[PDB]
Every structure is written in C-alpha cells, then in structure tokens.
Write a protein that binds this ligand. Structure first.
Ligand code: ADP
Lengths: 34, 97, 55, 221
C-alpha cells in the first residue's frame, strides 16, 4: 500500500547510485617430431 | 580516455625509453617526472610555449639529472623563431622579472 | 677496379653449442613446419622458438 | 604540505576574506594545484568543506585533477565531466549541495554553460587560464558568465605576450578601470604601474625555494 509511493523513488535511486558508481570508476581510471 | 593509460605506463614503469608529444596537446600539466631529458624537434612561432612545455618535465620529482635540446635548421626559416624568441624574451622577462 | 668503396658490415650473431633441437613436421598437410632449438656457452644457455625459413 | 605552500594558502585566504580574484603565478613544480586543494579543508569556517565548486582545465589534465583528491584529502565528493553526450550529460541526472566539486574543460564549457548555470558555485578554479588570453573568443565571452564569489586563475607562468593579450585576464579578474586600453597604456614608469596593478593579486618566487634541493636544466641548442 504506502510503500509504493517510496518504491517509485528508491527503486530508481539505487539504480542511479549504481550507474553513477560504474560510470565514475571508468571516469576516474598432429605433427611428427625429430 | 587514451591520454590516461599511456601516461600510466610511462610514469611508474621503466619499460619505455621515449614519448612523442605535440607542443600543444602535451605541453600543459601532464607532469611526466619519469623523464630526465627533452628534445624539441620543433620550436613554436609563439615564444615561451616551448619553456612552458619544458617545465612539464622540469620539476621536483627528478632526483637524477635534467636536460633540454632544441634541433634547428641553419638559417633556412627556423632561425626566425630563435630570433623572435630572443627578441620577445625581454618583454616576457620584464612583466614578471 | 682502382676506386674502392669501403663498407662496414656490422651484424648481430648468436654463437653457441647446440644442446638439443626439435623439428615438427605435419602428417601430410600444406607444410607448416615448426620447431625449437637450444644453444649453450661456457657461461649461459637459452631456447629459441624457430621460424619457417630458419628450419 | 611544505611551509611555503601554507604561506601561499593564507595569501589566497586573504584574497577570499577581501573578495578579490587573482593569479597563483608561483613557479611550476611546487604543488600548483595543491595550493588550491587546501582552500576546501584548511578554513575553520565550515562552508568551504560542504559548498558547490567547479574546475575548468586543459583536457590532458582530466586525470591528476581527480587523483589529487585520492591523496591530499580523499574526503571530497568530486565529479569528473567529459565523454560522448550520454557519457557526460547523464551525470547531471545523478546529482539533481549534494555533490561538491565538478571537473571540466574549455571545449565543453563553451557549449554546456546553459546546463552549468542550473547550479551555483561558491568558488571557481580555472587551470592554465592563459586559455582565456583572447577576449575576442567565444570561450572568454561565455566564461565571464559563471557564478561565484571568487575566481582563482592557475597558470604555468601567466601572460608573456604583447598587449593585445594582457587585457583579457586582467579584465576577467576585475572590471574596475578596465573600460579601454588608452589610460591602461599609461597605467620604467609604465611597467612599474602595470606591476602594481598585478602585485596586489599575483604571487612571484623564483625557483630558489626548491633549487636549494634541485640542480639546473642543462640546456642545448
Ligand atoms: N605527501 C608528499 N610527500 C612528499 N612530497 C610531496 C607530497 N605531496 C606532494 N609532494 C611533491 O609533489 C610533487 C609533484 O607536484 P604535483 O602534484 O604534480 O604539482 P605540480 O603541478 O606543481 O608539479 C612531487 O615531486 C612530490 O614529491
């Protein structure tokens, strides 16, 4: 019920933080034999 | 992106002898203190830009020795650079020294 | 015949005693031979992976 | 930090207290960028630790400008800004102060100013500021329009060209008396006045502060 009002932010926000991190770490770095 | 890994292999290794730079992409802030010596195969038409580029080798981390070379044609045209450089050097001193 | 042209030929040589050789030859094939060779001195020794014209 | 670095830092702190823009024209190889790093961490007045800030730089230095903030003080929220459009622009969707200092270069800034003006800065750091020497440039005409209390110019020795390129950096530091060249050409004598225009907002040393430890360049033609 009430959680979805926050999920619509935080589910995206955890993805923003992760995408920022993985961008920023690039942005800061037979045969014979005789 | 490419400007990082070439510097990161030239600093912090003994694997390489020499690096090629343009006077204007290489001349600013790179701090290649792994270098002992510099050759200007060309001097620039704007004087002191060579000196600004020399000091991106010349700084405190160089424990061993320091040298710089200029290679110049005998009077054909490249003399006009060393002329206009020595001529403008008086102005370029007297604004700070 | 009475004008000399004088040339320094300077080249790198390997001068050693053969320890062992392996030559590998295909069962029939196109002829892509391959092999290894080893050389010694009274001080030092090493292995060379061989090329096609060397073989 | 060696004592001369702290001395230059307190002179920049005096220009901060006085609200004055200036040129960090100490010699090269001394901690040029390092004399700016301590502006954030040294002052007890709190604001310098948590404000928004921005750096403009020549593109080949978009590496040491983040590596410094891994050793001198590693605590800063620092954001690099360069790449393909969706490499760079997308970082503005993450920070939308919540993140402190942004690193940039002149080719980007002259196009991106419309985005950068969406955020205020406390201080502006401008590295190899001789990039602004041409007041005719689209770059200088736009870079004048960034928002801060202080602009600090860093250079590998400033100016060193004819009067057509003296005007732009002085005018970028102060608009006062910088209406036209005619009286400024009057302001030995003329050079002494031009020196006393620069000296209240430019430092000098000669390398002897480090040539106690370092030997000469062997220079050859
Ligand atoms: N913690 C430190 N310990 C010793 N030397 C330091 C330290 N921090 C800075 N330096 C000196 O900084 C010099 C490099 O300066 P750098 O950061 O590249 O600034 P600059 O552009 O002025 O040369 C090195 O020679 C190094 O010895």
């Amino acid at each position: 019920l009430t959680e979805e009002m926050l999920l619509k932010r935080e589910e995206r926000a955890r993805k923003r933080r992760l995408q920022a991190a993985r961008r920023a770490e690039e942005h800061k770095n037979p045969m014979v034999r005789y | 992106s490419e400007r990082r890994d070439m510097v990161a292999d030239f600093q912090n290794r003994n694997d390489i002898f020499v690096f090629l730079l343009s006077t204007r992409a290489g001349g600013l802030g790179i701090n290649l203190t792994a270098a002992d010596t510099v050759i200007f195969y060309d001097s620039d038409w704007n004087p002191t830009v060579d000196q600004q580029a020399m000091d991106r080798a010349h700084r405190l981390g160089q424990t061993k020795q320091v040298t710089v070379y200029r290679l110049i044609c005998k009077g054909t045209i490249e003399e006009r650079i060393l002329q206009r450089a020595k001529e403008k050097s008086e102005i370029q001193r007297m604004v700070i020294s | 015949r009475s004008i000399g042209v004088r040339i320094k030929e300077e080249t790198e040589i390997i001068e050693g005693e053969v320890v062992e050789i392996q030559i590998d030859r295909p069962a029939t094939g196109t002829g892509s031979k391959v092999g290894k060779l080893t050389l010694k001195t009274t001080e030092m020794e090493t292995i060379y992976d061989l090329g096609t014209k060397m073989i | 930090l060696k004592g001369y670095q702290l001395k230059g830092m307190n002179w920049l702190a005096n220009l901060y207290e006085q609200g004055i823009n200036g040129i960090l024209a100490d010699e090269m190889g001394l901690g040029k960028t390092v004399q700016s790093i301590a502006l954030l961490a040294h002052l007890a007045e709190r604001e310098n630790i948590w404000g928004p800030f921005l750096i403009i730089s020549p593109a080949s230095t978009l590496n040491n400008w983040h590596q410094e903030f891994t050793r001198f003080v590693p605590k800063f929220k620092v954001l690099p800004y360069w790449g393909n459009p969706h490499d760079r622009k997308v970082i503005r969707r993450f920070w939308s102060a919540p993140f402190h200092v942004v690193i940039t270069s002149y080719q980007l800034v002259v196009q991106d100013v419309k985005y950068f003006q969406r955020v205020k800065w406390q201080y502006m750091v401008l590295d190899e500021a001789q990039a602004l020497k041409s007041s005719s440039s689209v770059r200088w005409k736009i870079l004048l329009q960034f928002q801060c209390r202080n602009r600090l110019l860093l250079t590998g020795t400033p100016i060193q060209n004819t009067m057509a390129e003296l005007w732009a950096l002085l005018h970028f530091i102060m608009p006062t008396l910088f209406d036209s060249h005619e009286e400024f050409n009057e302001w030995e004598n003329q050079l002494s006045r031009l020196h006393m225009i620069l000296k209240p907002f430019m430092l000098r040393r000669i390398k002897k502060d480090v040539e106690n430890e370092l030997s000469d360049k062997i220079e050859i033609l």
